[PDB]
Amino acid sequence: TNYKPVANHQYNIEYERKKKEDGKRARADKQHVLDMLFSAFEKHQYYNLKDLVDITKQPVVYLKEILKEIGVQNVKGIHKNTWELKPE
Amino acid sequence: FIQMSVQRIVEDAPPIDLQAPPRYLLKFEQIYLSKPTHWERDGAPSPMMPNEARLRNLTYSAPLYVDITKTVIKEGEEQLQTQHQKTFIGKIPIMLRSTYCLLNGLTDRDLCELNECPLDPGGYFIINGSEKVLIA
Amino acid sequence: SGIVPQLQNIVSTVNLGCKLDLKTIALRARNAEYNPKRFAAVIMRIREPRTTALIFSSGKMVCTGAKSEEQSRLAARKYARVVQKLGFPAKFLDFKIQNMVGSCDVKFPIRLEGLVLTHQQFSSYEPELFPGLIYRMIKPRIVLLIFVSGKVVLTGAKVRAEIYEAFENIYPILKGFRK
Amino acid sequence: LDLAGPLLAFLFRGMFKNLLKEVRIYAQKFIDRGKDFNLELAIKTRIISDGLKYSLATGNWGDQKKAHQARAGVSQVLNRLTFASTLSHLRRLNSPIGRDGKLAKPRQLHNTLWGMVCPAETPEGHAVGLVKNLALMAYISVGSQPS
Amino acid sequence: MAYQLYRNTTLGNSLQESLDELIQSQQITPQLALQVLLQFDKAINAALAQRVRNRVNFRGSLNTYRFCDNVWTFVLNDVEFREVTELIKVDKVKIVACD
Amino acid sequence: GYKFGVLAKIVNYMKTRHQRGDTHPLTLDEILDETQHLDIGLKQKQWLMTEALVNNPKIEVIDGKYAFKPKYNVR
Amino acid sequence: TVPKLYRSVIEDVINDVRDIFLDDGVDEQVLMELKTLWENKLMGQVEEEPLNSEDDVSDEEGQELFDTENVVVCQYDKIHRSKNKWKFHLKDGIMNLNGRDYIFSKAIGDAEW
Amino acid sequence: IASACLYIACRQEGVPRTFKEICAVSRISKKEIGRCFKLILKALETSVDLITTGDFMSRFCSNLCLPKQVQMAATHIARKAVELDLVPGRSPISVAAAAIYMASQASAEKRTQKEIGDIAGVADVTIRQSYRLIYPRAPDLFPTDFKFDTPVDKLPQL
């Protein structure tokens, strides 16, 4: 009864169902994304790119371009170089 | 070792706890052994007689199965417990004429039908067709 | 042979030569449905030609569902005009048929086992994956789905002549494996 | 005296640890992605199958890379030249020299071997007195819980 | 700043009309009316999801459909509504759905 | 953003405005109108006037008002 | 039955806005007047660039302009269509049929396009 | 790629494992393995012999603990059914599963449709469909020298 033949693993189909139901992130208008990015800046000084993506919920490539337009990344010797929301 | 140590060792192992935050718990509790089995090219299992192990240079091992209980917590005050009965984890080499050998309790005529010497004392392992004895 | 494949689906692509606003089109278009989370295009459907077209913000559109070349272009023009009516400078540039799908029957059962053995270099028959036999025609680049019931589906053709030529080439081969 | 049981239990303890160390790694990777994991796929069966047979086949104990401290000669090919040789091989005892052997000479026949170890059967040569055999009615206890 | 679905209804229209009447009398500032509408939308949304436990069925012919901003705008023609207790007939209906 | 998000949009809007070709200076209040920052805090209004719009190397104070600095940039 | 739901909605609405009215500093007397007015109101083309070769390829565009017909507001959990027919799996929602107000929890619908 | 390679290696050696069997031992789904399977054949410019119903009888029957005579009877039934074209277009696994059920019900060791499906990875409905197609010719498919624990006339009808 071990390794019984299966078309697809139960975990794999459930994960696919969740991803299919959720769908891919959409490209929101720059103004809305910029407002969300600025608003979240109050909570904390600096954000990680991966974590910032979850907060904004936008494609990484699109988010990076928007972040590059205003935001910059500062090198930190303690953990790594991280993006800084402050344009200056 | 088969009847006590193998079971004691697995139960001695602490349950596996995994955190992502959903929590996954895995516990090994029960051990099962089958007769020394050999799998052909087609994958059909057949019992493995020691003489066949000697002649075909097969290791004389018994499949080892463990019951595993998996419980999942989704930080939503719900608990789901599922158990995987008889999970294959490996093959234990079997000492000939031990309680877990195919030649256990067989009468002398039964041994001869299997091309086994009734006077053979056992007490060794067939690893890749070589009768291997562990020196105390 | 006496059997002519019947075009079941026609896929054509046209360029409108103008960037489009998908959100505006969906809000104004009668039958358009837009879901960026699902797909990046706008899906519009029409009844009289019975075709579906995908409209992208780049201005390129793909038309599918047409059963004939004339219908596909007419449906594509209808979609282009609709977008033009919505305030965009849509045009009809470099309209092209990308894929044609045809179906037909040989009116007799076929032994796929023999066909794949004789044409192992073109035939891929895996009942585990798909009951039909996938024959990849070479001289015409046409993929044919041959079934035991005798139904044959031709796809990948850029022009109607390819469909007829491919079926003409395969018919004698199938006739040799009649069941 | 370390017989097959205690010797094999020592191996199985490590191999099971590696097996459980492996399922953690496999399961954690799937959990990090967030997708649930399949228990059967996590278990690597070769760990216990190959680990137990490799030691018996070669006679070395522990991991293969750790052969430096691995005891050698524990597992030997059964002697089948005569029935007596086969019987004696299955009742052989080994006294490793190691640090312990240097302090007190173990080749000499001790008084306490009476009835337990055959006083006559010992190899001639560099192994005199180190390789021993059980007396006929001598028995090695298998142990039990003191509870 | 909410879903804002039931505003374009008889219940929503009456509330909006009442707010305008008070505004014309200088009794309520426009900000208050917006807040009242937002609270009303929350209350009705919660009320429907909680106190509505009746099932119905309907059949019809689709004439037009749209999908933008996760909003369906199906336009059905010759729709027959079937319920365990009553049946209704309507020539044309517009269905606005959100999720 | 409070005390930090508003200024970013002012700079971005000002940069875009210059690209159009409007060299004419703009007042603090005028710029706030098109940037949807009319509700900006009072203490930020003086902070931007006194620090942000003078310390930055891309802001030129002309006749009291503020204009881009294309002269410093190579054009 | 329908009126009783409306009255319960009113009770929830007034309770929900009590905190807002206290917060904004407006007198509570406004709410009493609000309900009174609220109740009263209710009760060979070689050259292909031109697209003008075809005319009147669209139907009436004022269908959504009027919106005077019955309108249904609902929430959809699943809406799928298989090449001919649209199937609607809509959860709790409201309807306005011939002026009458209808409320449903679960509904199923199949349509042909 | 490895899962498809494992599937191809089994096919080349004359002991095919069904796509479901390879999937059960791999984190890769059957759909993905099949996609890789076709690509590898094109890349290697190789081919695999078409699988037959008897290529899985030994594994399936042994995994079901069915007697050898039942296995021979099932192989004869499956081979004859394909020869008679009683199941045109049906997957060889489904034919084998139905043949095993027909043979199993005719002997002392009887396995339910669910049991045969689990080992073979075929839904009982598919086994039911194939069984219904070969049931009419049950006496012909069975080997002549077969001992019927349950008479062919009394085989389950469904």
PDB file of C-alpha atoms in Angstrom, chain G residues 40-98:
ATOM      1  CA  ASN G  40     -41.158  58.975   4.247  1.00  0.00           C
ATOM      2  CA  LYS G  41     -39.292  58.858   0.926  1.00  0.00           C
ATOM      3  CA  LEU G  42     -39.401  55.055   0.688  1.00  0.00           C
ATOM      4  CA  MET G  43     -43.103  54.595   1.464  1.00  0.00           C
ATOM      5  CA  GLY G  44     -11.069  42.693 -53.591  1.00  0.00           C
ATOM      6  CA  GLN G  45     -10.125  45.076 -50.777  1.00  0.00           C
ATOM      7  CA  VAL G  46      -6.417  45.216 -51.564  1.00  0.00           C
ATOM      8  CA  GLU G  47      -6.044  48.355 -49.425  1.00  0.00           C
ATOM      9  CA  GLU G  48      -7.170  47.468 -45.901  1.00  0.00           C
ATOM     10  CA  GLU G  49      -6.362  50.535 -43.772  1.00  0.00           C
ATOM     11  CA  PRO G  50      -9.934  51.954 -43.797  1.00  0.00           C
ATOM     12  CA  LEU G  51     -12.352  50.224 -41.429  1.00  0.00           C
ATOM     13  CA  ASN G  52     -15.361  52.093 -42.863  1.00  0.00           C
ATOM     14  CA  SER G  53     -16.060  49.329 -45.403  1.00  0.00           C
ATOM     15  CA  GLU G  54     -18.422  47.852 -42.783  1.00  0.00           C
ATOM     16  CA  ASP G  55     -21.166  49.935 -41.170  1.00  0.00           C
ATOM     17  CA  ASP G  56     -23.723  49.247 -38.431  1.00  0.00           C
ATOM     18  CA  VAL G  57     -21.751  46.379 -36.899  1.00  0.00           C
ATOM     19  CA  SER G  58     -23.062  47.151 -33.393  1.00  0.00           C
ATOM     20  CA  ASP G  59     -26.383  47.097 -31.559  1.00  0.00           C
ATOM     21  CA  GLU G  60     -27.999  49.758 -29.373  1.00  0.00           C
ATOM     22  CA  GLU G  61     -25.387  51.281 -27.057  1.00  0.00           C
ATOM     23  CA  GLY G  62     -27.896  52.776 -24.597  1.00  0.00           C
ATOM     24  CA  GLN G  63     -28.695  49.528 -22.777  1.00  0.00           C
ATOM     25  CA  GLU G  64     -26.528  50.531 -19.803  1.00  0.00           C
ATOM     26  CA  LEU G  65     -27.392  54.235 -20.123  1.00  0.00           C
ATOM     27  CA  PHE G  66     -30.986  53.749 -18.946  1.00  0.00           C
ATOM     28  CA  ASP G  67     -30.664  51.084 -16.218  1.00  0.00           C
ATOM     29  CA  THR G  68     -34.379  51.613 -15.518  1.00  0.00           C
ATOM     30  CA  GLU G  69     -35.112  47.876 -15.745  1.00  0.00           C
ATOM     31  CA  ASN G  70     -34.768  45.430 -12.863  1.00  0.00           C
ATOM     32  CA  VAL G  71     -31.252  45.308 -11.403  1.00  0.00           C
ATOM     33  CA  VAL G  72     -29.722  42.475  -9.366  1.00  0.00           C
ATOM     34  CA  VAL G  73     -26.855  43.042  -6.923  1.00  0.00           C
ATOM     35  CA  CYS G  74     -25.094  39.960  -5.596  1.00  0.00           C
ATOM     36  CA  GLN G  75     -21.748  38.360  -4.784  1.00  0.00           C
ATOM     37  CA  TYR G  76     -20.303  35.621  -6.995  1.00  0.00           C
ATOM     38  CA  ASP G  77     -18.303  32.662  -5.698  1.00  0.00           C
ATOM     39  CA  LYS G  78     -17.914  30.915  -9.074  1.00  0.00           C
ATOM     40  CA  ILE G  79     -18.980  31.816 -12.627  1.00  0.00           C
ATOM     41  CA  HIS G  80     -17.921  29.455 -15.421  1.00  0.00           C
ATOM     42  CA  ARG G  81     -18.933  29.052 -19.058  1.00  0.00           C
ATOM     43  CA  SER G  82     -18.355  26.037 -21.341  1.00  0.00           C
ATOM     44  CA  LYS G  83     -18.369  27.161 -24.979  1.00  0.00           C
ATOM     45  CA  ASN G  84     -22.121  27.867 -25.087  1.00  0.00           C
ATOM     46  CA  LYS G  85     -23.658  28.394 -21.660  1.00  0.00           C
ATOM     47  CA  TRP G  86     -22.902  30.659 -18.701  1.00  0.00           C
ATOM     48  CA  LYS G  87     -23.352  29.063 -15.270  1.00  0.00           C
ATOM     49  CA  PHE G  88     -23.671  31.404 -12.281  1.00  0.00           C
ATOM     50  CA  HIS G  89     -22.843  30.368  -8.705  1.00  0.00           C
ATOM     51  CA  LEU G  90     -23.864  33.491  -6.785  1.00  0.00           C
ATOM     52  CA  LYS G  91     -24.086  33.735  -2.996  1.00  0.00           C
ATOM     53  CA  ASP G  92     -26.197  36.058  -0.819  1.00  0.00           C
ATOM     54  CA  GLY G  93     -27.480  39.061  -2.745  1.00  0.00           C
ATOM     55  CA  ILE G  94     -30.403  41.396  -3.345  1.00  0.00           C
ATOM     56  CA  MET G  95     -32.752  41.978  -6.270  1.00  0.00           C
ATOM     57  CA  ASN G  96     -35.226  44.679  -7.331  1.00  0.00           C
ATOM     58  CA  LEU G  97     -37.848  43.019  -9.546  1.00  0.00           C
ATOM     59  CA  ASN G  98     -40.758  45.220 -10.661  1.00  0.00           C
TER      60      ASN G  98
END
